C-alpha cells in the first residue's frame, strides 16, 4: 500500500487524484476512464491495468 495505490487493485494511477476515481471503479469491476468491464478482484483488475493508461489521459 501507498499514496500512489489504489484500495481494491492494488495497482498504480497517472495521479493521485484520478486514484479517488480509479477505487470507485475497481469496486464495480471497471475501469475509470475506457469504461472495460471484468471481474471486481485485484488478479483481474491488474490484468486490464498492466494493458491500460487511459486512467489518466
Ligand atoms: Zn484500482
Ligand atoms: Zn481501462
Given at each position: 500500500?501507498?499514496?500512489?495505490v489504489?484500495?481494491?487493485?492494488?495497482?498504480?494511477?497517472?495521479?493521485?487524484?484520478?486514484?479517488?476515481?480509479?477505487?470507485?471503479?475497481?469496486?464495480?469491476?471497471?475501469?475509470?476512464?475506457?469504461?472495460?468491464?471484468?471481474?471486481?478482484?485485484?488478479?483481474?483488475?491488474?490484468?486490464?491495468?498492466?494493458?491500460?493508461?487511459?486512467?489518466?489521459?
Amino acid at each position: 500500500m501507498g499514496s500512489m495505490v489504489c484500495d481494491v487493485c492494488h495497482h498504480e494511477c497517472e495521479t493521485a487524484k484520478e486514484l479517488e476515481s480509479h477505487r470507485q471503479s475497481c469496486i464495480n469491476g471497471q475501469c475509470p476512464y475506457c469504461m472495460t468491464i471484468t471481474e471486481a478482484t485485484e488478479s483481474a483488475l491488474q490484468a486490464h491495468y498492466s494493458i491500460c493508461k487511459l486512467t489518466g489521459r
